[PDB]
Design a protein around this nucleic acid. Structure first.
Ligand code: ZN
Lengths: 146, 177, 156, 94, 82
RNA sequence: CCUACUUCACAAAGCGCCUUCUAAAUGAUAUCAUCUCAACUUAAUACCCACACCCAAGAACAGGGUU
């Protein structure tokens, strides 16, 4: 990566470029997810995968730089949102209720004062439906609404 | 076997204090374990009339963890019987009032809706912190495993755990971050 | 076909590796030989059999009582060998059949003590507004068996 | 005597002393009573299992509402085990 | 090294088939508590009902009495067994 | 609540008096921007609590006082 060193002087210094591991097990895949057999096999828990696509101040990287699938870019974008809120990315700050699997922004959701009748009940969203097609090792699928 | 009648009978129906750490746990998934041990449904000697419930000590119930936006959406509604006395309060506000009441209401809803329910609630001991009284610490027998596996964060991965995971993609040599 | 270790890479259950059938059939031969030595040298104490007498399974030791809901058409005092024993346990071993045990292995005896009737047992039907009210009183026959002995034999 | 325990028939006081004397007759050391399991120690309904070890191998262990009760009862379990009069003994052959 | 359950706490379970494959022999002697796993032996109506409630961890209701109709329905010579 | 006034007069009253406490910045997806169902940062006390006779206590019971 390159940095913008300044003090009045402003210069740009290419510093310490990484590289991807030499042997993708699925070469001639397209996305770096697709190349490494990870099309449905990651969640918000595993932050070693999420952290590689994140700006050091917590934001996402654009799809052109990462070269992701469109699908997997929305999935990682969502999982990174769901992992900032569970406090799994503490060092991606710019400078207390425990959550996990939060689809919406916590300061934006009106409380359910009238949960409906049994045939029209307002449910609470848990997790994201972008992560439907993950490998469920249970028989029941993910309940996305509690 | 080969006990006398009275100490065998004492041994079988004796009740056991369980500890249950509720840090980073969901309250309903604590409430299920707690409810089973409060009714005595984890004993093969169980019967409804035989009164064989246990004690459940749940600690760290300030440190519960709702899944999804249940902190901001889930509503606890009560009514003082007076007119205009209907009080709906979200899970966050009620957790700032009393850091026991979410786990307490969860368990209290799980238990069978009968008259044994409040004797069962007087067997459950909720504490919001690491601090448990000494008279209760001298009763505990087994600590139950937490039902949710707390996912570790990026600070808590060791170096070899980070190194074992591959870098997936080559960044461009000139990109700013 | 490598997947890096994520949450959902592997299944969450730990893999078990079942032992190979050569050393496992040899190991079974060792165990059956041990238990057969316990049956030969009389190491066991008292037994309990699960016996499929009549239509149901009775868990049974020696010196006890079973109340059966039909007349067996035997005289009081007659001894009986209960076939269809399907579990036999001691303190340190059990033996369970697929689904029944060998007749040469286990022998369960039982005498008939008494042949009673049940207490009178009401059968009432009633539908409202229809004048529908029947009443019957039924007593089923019953016999009591006293399990005398569970003898076990070294035939493994 | 079917369904009756030994010390429902042969009543004794002080089973611990009796167990001590019997273990002297087999030329075994005096047993250490040694608290194996417990629950509800600070309540009106405790449960104890006192064990009785001889050269750090237990011979019997019994429950009780107090520690003394459980120790006496473990002494009784050991005495049933020395005399063959256990709950699991071979039944009477008639 | 396979164990179908952690043979640690109740009995050491050792399953077997016979050569005919007709009976399953289970062998299961008891697991004694180790000596190392042991500790040495250590050496008015309102307030009375609250005191009993708090003592036996029950509610207050079973300490109030009951009337004669319920005291006389009770079977004082109930059937015993075993 | 009764000092006055008024109905009245060992007192009760009112017409009389007293008291009444979502919005910013920053900022990614989408290198600009962008309020962000993106992340980060920022904006209940009071009250109450131990015979008999008279009573400002009172339907009875209860309560207060009886030095
Ligand atoms: Zn792809």
């Amino acid at each position: 990566f390159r940095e913008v060193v300044e003090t009045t002087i402003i210069e740009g210094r290419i510093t310490a470029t990484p590289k991807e591991s030499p042997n993708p097990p699925n070469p001639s895949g397209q996305c770096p997810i697709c190349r490494w057999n990870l099309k449905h096999k990651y969640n918000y828990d595993d932050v070693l995968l999420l952290s590689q696509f994140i700006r050091p101040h917590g934001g996402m990287l654009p799809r052109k730089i990462t070269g992701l699938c469109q699908e997997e870019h929305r999935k990682i974008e969502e999982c990174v949102k769901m992992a900032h809120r569970a406090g799994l990315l503490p060092n991606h700050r710019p400078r207390q209720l425990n959550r996990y699997l939060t689809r919406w922004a916590p300061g934006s959701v009106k409380p359910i004062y009238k949960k409906g009748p049994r045939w029209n009940r307002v449910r609470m969203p848990v997790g994201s439906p972008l992560l439907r097609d993950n490998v469920c090792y249970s028989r029941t699928p993910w309940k996305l609404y509690h | 076997s080969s006990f006398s009648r009275a100490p065998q009978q004492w041994a079988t129906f004796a009740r056991i204090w369980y500890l249950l750490d509720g840090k980073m746990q969901p309250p309903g998934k604590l409430a299920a374990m707690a409810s089973i041990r409060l009714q005595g449904l984890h004993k093969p000697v169980y019967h409804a009339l035989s009164d064989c419930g246990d004690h459940v000590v749940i600690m760290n119930t300030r440190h519960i963890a709702f899944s999804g936006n249940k902190w901001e959406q889930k509503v606890y509604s009560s009514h003082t019987g007076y007119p205009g006395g209907f009080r709906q309060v979200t899970a966050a506000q009620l957790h700032l009032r009393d850091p026991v009441a979410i786990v307490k209401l969860a368990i209290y809803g799980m238990l069978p809706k009968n008259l044994h329910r409040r004797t069962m609630m007087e067997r459950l001991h909720l504490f919001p912190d690491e601090y448990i009284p000494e008279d209760i610490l001298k009763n505990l027998v087994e600590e139950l495993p937490q039902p949710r596996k707390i996912p570790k964060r990026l600070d808590e991965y060791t170096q070899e755990e980070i190194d074992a995971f591959p870098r997936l993609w080559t960044p461009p040599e000139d990109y700013r971050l | 076909g490598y997947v890096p270790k994520t949450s959902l890479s592997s299944p969450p259950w730990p893999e078990v590796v079942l032992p190979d059938p050569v050393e496992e059939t040899r190991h079974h031969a060792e165990v059956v030989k041990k238990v057969n030595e316990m049956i030969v040298t009389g190491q066991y104490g008292r037994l309990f059999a699960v016996v499929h007498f009549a239509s149901r399974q009775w868990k049974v030791t020696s010196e006890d009582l079973i109340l059966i809901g039909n007349e067996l058409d035997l005289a009081c005092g007659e001894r009986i060998r209960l076939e269809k024993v399907l579990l036999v346990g001691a303190d340190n071993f059990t033996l369970l059949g697929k689904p029944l045990l060998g007749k040469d292995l286990v022998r369960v005896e039982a005498t008939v003590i008494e042949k009673t009737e049940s207490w009178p047992r009401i059968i009432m039907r009633f539908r409202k507004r229809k004048n529908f009210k029947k009443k019957r009183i039924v007593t089923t026959p019953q016999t009591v068996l006293r399990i005398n002995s569970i003898e076990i034999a070294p035939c493994l | 005597m079917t369904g009756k325990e030994l010390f429902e028939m042969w009543k004794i006081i002080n089973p611990m002393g009796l167990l001590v004397e019997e273990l002297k007759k087999r030329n075994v050391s005096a047993p250490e009573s040694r608290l194996t399991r417990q629950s509800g120690g600070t309540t009106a309904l405790p449960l104890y299992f006192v064990g009785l070890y001889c050269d750090k191998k237990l011979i019997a262990e019994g429950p009780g509402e107090t520690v003394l009760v459980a120790e006496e009862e473990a002494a009784r379990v050991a005495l049933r085990k020395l005399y063959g009069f256990t709950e699991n003994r071979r039944p009477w052959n008639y | 090294t396979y164990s179908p359950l952690p043979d640690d706490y109740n009995c050491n379970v050792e399953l077997a088939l016979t050569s005919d494959g007709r009976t399953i022999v289970c062998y299961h002697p008891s697991v004694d508590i180790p000596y190392e796993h042991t500790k040495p032996i250590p050496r008015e109506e309102g307030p009375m009902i609250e005191q009993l409630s708090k003592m036996f961890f029950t509610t207050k209701h079973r300490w109030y009495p009951h009337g004669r109709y319920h005291r006389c329905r009770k079977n004082l010579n109930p059937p015993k067994d075993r």
